[PDB]
From Swiss-Prot:
Protein name as annotated: Endothiapepsin
Enzyme Commission number(s) from the entry: 3.4.23.22
Stretches of the chain forming a coiled coil according to its record: none
The family this protein is said to belong to: Belongs to the peptidase A1 family.
Source organism, top-level taxon: Eukaryota
Active site: D35, S199
Lineage: Eukaryota, Fungi, Dikarya, Ascomycota, Pezizomycotina
Organism, scientific name: Cryphonectria parasitica
Gene Ontology molecular function terms on file: aspartic-type endopeptidase activity
Single GO BP term: proteolysis
Disulfide-linked positions: C255-C290
Designated gene of the protein: EAPA
Full-length numbering of the shown residues: 90 to 419 of 419
Amino acid sequence: STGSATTTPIDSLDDAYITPVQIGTPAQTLNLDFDTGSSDLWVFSSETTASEVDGQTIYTPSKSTTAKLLSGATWSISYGDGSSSSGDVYTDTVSVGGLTVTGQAVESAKKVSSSFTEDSTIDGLLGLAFSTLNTVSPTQQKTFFDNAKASLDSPVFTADLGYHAPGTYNFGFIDTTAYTGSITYTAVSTKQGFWEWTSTGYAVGSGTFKSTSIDGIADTGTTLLYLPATVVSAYWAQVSGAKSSSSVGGYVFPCSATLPSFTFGVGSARIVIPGDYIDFGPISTGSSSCFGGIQSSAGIGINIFGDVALKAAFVVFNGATTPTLGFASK
């Protein structure tokens, strides 16, 4: 089997991408944030504290003839941005782009943190990291991809995120028309539960490539590119007037600037992030200070190849017995 679904930016900055997901019988379609940095499929629901729902579409398990309470199971998650959610668990039929999994754990939120409530466009998350990170207790549950894998034509999914445009998540096949050149595959460590890999270096604009190992994660659920402070300083030094602002929370730059590209290495191959992809717009409405799309990871503990980096590539998440990642230009 295969599946193919369009993923759409939630706003004009590409802050996140939403993909329609069919849950239950009859189908309830929710728009979920596919997140290769986490491993829970959780949704706003008829159980979510009413004051914490503000425009989201909810899953109502009592209206699904295939929903079953997973007795005793609870979940609770905290994300790298400080947001969180928790609740109970149903199993139900879940379909993405024509690919159907029966008995998928659907984590129904009883509580969500304010950042979720305040984002009316995201109805939940669909985790695509390794199932070892799933938070369901006392019996950990499998991700959608883990449940689907054996049925897929090939045990892979691909992320093709658009810049200011829709893109595609495919399951079970690699669309050879969706990229240019060849796909370069690179090793993955699953020891932290992530799609963790090592970039071979970077370049700023037309500058020389610096060969240096940068360990980080491929994370579709993170907006920006978080890299070591040395790398980030070298990038922003090429933007007149850019500076790190402790009060804003990162590098800012004059909105009048033209940003240089940023290249990262995948083996001997190179992925070029155009400068425009690094502009996240005014820090507040009407400001002429703009927020940068490349930020320091120093306070995180891990480097993160988020959407800024991934949307410059066609990305293969190869879930074979020994997982690997593939990157192609497009």
